[PDB]
Design a protein around this ligand. Structure first.
Ligand SMILES: NC(=O)C1=CN([C@@H]2O[C@H](COP(=O)(O)OP(=O)(O)OC[C@H]3O[C@@H](n4cnc5c(N)ncnc54)[C@H](OP(=O)(O)O)[C@@H]3O)[C@@H](O)[C@H]2O)C=CC1
Ligand SMILES: NC(=O)C1=CN([C@@H]2O[C@H](COP(=O)(O)OP(=O)(O)OC[C@H]3O[C@@H](n4cnc5c(N)ncnc54)[C@H](OP(=O)(O)O)[C@@H]3O)[C@@H](O)[C@H]2O)C=CC1
Ligand SMILES: C[C@@H](Nc1nc(N[C@H](C)C(F)(F)F)nc(-c2cccc(Cl)n2)n1)C(F)(F)F
Ligand SMILES: [Mg+2]
Ligand SMILES: [Mg+2]
Lengths: 412, 411
């Protein structure tokens, strides 16, 4: 009776998300789906015990099977190290997994017709693709104490004459100086990932750069994106009635606000980092934002919620108090992974189920059963009442009932 | 009869704005106000004629008198040179003026209750202060052909104990690399104007940086602001129930969208550049954006519309077709400069008039009299009708008539 799932790699998470994650699998997924499951505990204690070995093993497994579903994880910081008595301040699991996999992360927010938005106009998804190999985020930056000259020099490994340029001469006073770089392969991968995501998504693609100011530096991003599109992707875009274009960031943010959504926006690392929160904020609650990591090959996908472990809610949970935490992003992480898995294996039965969960989840909210954060959006935070929303367990049950009804209705 | 304005420096502009500028003076300012007016023609032909000396003359004049009102001016490009056959491809007047004055531009958009905005929340002005001296805008960026080592080095004037930082070593392939800088002094001036602007306008001030990512580079911006504030302005802010705080940029944009407005936002040069276009748009039409330039001393202010010459409208006007160009931003430049002059001169009447002009202009729109861009905001772009909006002359005349009535009751 159960659908045959295929092979998926599952990673367990931390805190509030973890409680939901088990609930989602137990009620939402396992009953109707059978999977070959490779399960890794990415929970902070396990990561600590394994030395972060488990995280690496999990990342490798995703490469082997091509599909990953992930739960939000604690990212170690000094307070955390003190809290868990961690052996070391471990690197973020997302950071490690992205590093091993390569590929680019795209964040999109689920939209419900009843829920209001900061930007009312945005009735279609806007998807942000983030280039996380950073010009800014891998940068050499320093204070300039006193008058001096700052120069940037490139030395060819081939023994060709080295080139030096004077960034500035500080005749008087202090300054701040910086050096940053980007590499052709990362940009190339990023472009390949974005074209493929758009083609898979069904939406048009834009890339934003301040290429007018920084003709050489941002020109490479623009040039690489054009070169790849023309050579390998354009006809497919033509067939699917969608396009790729390059936009200046000032134009794009303004255009995006005016716009009704429905596009994939490809962002350089600084732009993407700013964009990811802002776009989510415009849409609504963080509970409704999902992250998908997509590699250049297009075979491999890792899906996780955009939001974190939701510690503030979890603390209430520990205290024995009631919580209303949104599972939609976490639920959607599963559905997206399943859909890709269905896509790779050409499994319609799985594909149908992954969609069915998404429809059910939206339909339930659209009918007025929702977590507190959603309720706040319609009411306003002050005006929300306990009757207005379901608690975390209550919402999942309503979702479970609906999922059962929906699937049965489909049969026949 | 006529209020005594005091000394003002007025610069004529180009194209459509120039036509409006004459209309504003003729029907709005001159009848009720008498000024010591020093007038420079920044219109493109005159600028070409004088080799752009006049643009320099105006900037020097503003420093002397402390107040300038500016019409939008054409900034030359290869296309422009052919059209006017100019001798040289002249640099932008704002840039020339800005360089001579020093100072930081602040962009404020007028708010009308009737007009819808992309962000539902904003009911209060958000003012963006932009740091023109640029790390990005004065940077050396180069393509990297092949495997190489890229390094950034600082050498002290004495030449002792230089530091070398290796940005990257390209083992395989090619990339782009860049180096950028900023000045302690430029940042210091930028901070001073922003603080003075906040105190002057009675709003809280926020400075945004990526200091978590770029601790040394961003932090200086962050450090200089706190140090100046703690030393000089903090006491004044507390008296006025006002505060200054620093935000990470992602936090600031998200917080701003959720916000209702009412703050001054100080921006890094790249951040400001992105902010200016979007923020005006989020509020409404570009015709509603004004662009004051304020020096660190706080004595000296320059007022102009945020928008350009509006040539697309101008071409239609030339063709004999109908035009609906918003004068609100241009009108406000006059009002805001005058408000500064009144402050400097302690003139109650000049101060009263400037507010009345602003008040009337908002009131007129709120009543449902407007140009096409605003009507588009209310009705949606494709649903606008001729009945909805007033033509550029129609609007100005209504403003003149409404202003006269408003002034009349004061008497
Ligand atoms: N995907 C990942 O692996 C990520 C993990 N993290 C980790 O999360 C931990 C703590 O995260 P934090 O910084 O607090 O940010 P979170 O992503 O947990 O979000 C914090 C706040 O956002 C709102 N929120 C987020 N998700 C939900 C949800 N599902 N339902 C309802 N409200 C939600 C809540 O607002 P309110 O305050 O109103 O309750 C909550 O207080 C950190 O260890 C961090 O490392 C962080 C980012 C990404
Ligand atoms: N402060 C200054 O001196 C500035 C001058 N300029 C100069 O202006 C010239 C042309 O600038 P351009 O790039 O066309 O941009 P503009 O600022 O002139 O405006 C461009 C578009 O914005 C809309 N718009 C702007 N002002 C108004 C208004 N008052 N009422 C209604 N709509 C308005 C119009 O949109 P629509 O097309 O929908 O009508 C117009 O087509 C250039 O030479 C440029 O250098 C530019 C920027 C600043
Ligand atoms: C008007 C809005 N400003 C703003 N909006 C965006 N993106 C929005 C999510 C959207 F595109 F949807 F409008 N991005 C930026 C920004 C700033 C600095 C650097 C970069 Cl790269 N981007 N600023 C504010 F402030 F009101 F929120
Ligand atoms: Mg589609
Ligand atoms: Mg208790």
């Amino acid at each position: 009776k159960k659908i045959s799932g295929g092979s998926v790699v599952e990673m367990q998470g931390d805190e509030m998300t973890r409680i939901i994650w088990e609930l989602i699998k137990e009620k939402l997924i396992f009953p109707y789906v059978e999977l070959d499951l490779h399960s890794y505990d990415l929970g902070i204690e396990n990561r600590d015990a394994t030395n972060d070995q488990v995280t690496k093993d999990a990342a490798e497994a995703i490469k082997k099977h091509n599909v990953g579903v992930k739960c939000a994880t604690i990212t170690p910081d000094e307070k955390r190290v003190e809290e868990f008595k961690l052996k070391q301040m471990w690197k973020s699991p997302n950071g490690t997994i992205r590093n091993i996999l390569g590929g680019t992360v795209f964040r999109e927010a689920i939209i419900c017709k009843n829920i209001p938005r900061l930007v009312s106009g945005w009735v279609k998804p806007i998807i942000i693709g983030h280039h996380a190999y950073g010009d800014q985020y891998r940068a050499t930056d320093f204070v300039v104490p006193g008058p001096g000259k700052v120069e940037i020099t490139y030395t060819p490994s081939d023994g060709t004459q080295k080139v030096t340029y004077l960034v500035h001469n500080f005749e008087e006073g202090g300054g701040v100086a910086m050096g940053m770089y980007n590499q052709d392969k990362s940009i190339e991968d990023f472009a390949h990932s974005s074209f493929q995501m758009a083609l898979s998504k069904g939406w048009p693609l834009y890339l934003s750069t301040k290429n007018t100011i920084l003709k050489k530096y941002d020109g490479r991003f623009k040039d690489i994106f054009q070169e790849i599109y023309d050579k390998q992707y354009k006809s497919q875009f033509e067939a699917q009635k969608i396009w790729y274009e390059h936009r200046l960031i000032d134009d794009m943010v303004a255009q995006a606000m005016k716009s009704e959504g429905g596009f994939i926006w490809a962002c350089k690392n600084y732009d993407g980092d700013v964009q990811s929160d802002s776009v989510a904020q415009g849409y609504g609650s963080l509970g409704m934002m999902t992250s998908v990591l997509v590699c250049p090959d297009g075979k491999t996908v890792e899906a996780e919620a955009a939001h974190g472990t939701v510690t503030r809610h979890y603390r209430m949970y520990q205290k024995g108090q009631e919580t209303s935490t949104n599972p939609i992003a976490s639920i959607f992480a599963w559905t997206r992974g399943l859909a890709h898995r269905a896509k790779l294996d050409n499994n319609k039965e799985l594909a149908f189920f992954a969609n069915a969960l998404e429809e059910v989840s939206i339909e339930t909210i659209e009918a007025g059963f929702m977590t507190k954060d959603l309720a706040a959006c319609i009411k306003g935070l002050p005006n929300v009442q306990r009757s207005d929303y379901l608690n975390t367990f209550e919402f999942m049950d309503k979702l479970g009932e609906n999922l059962k009804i929906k699937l049965a209705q489909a049969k026949l």
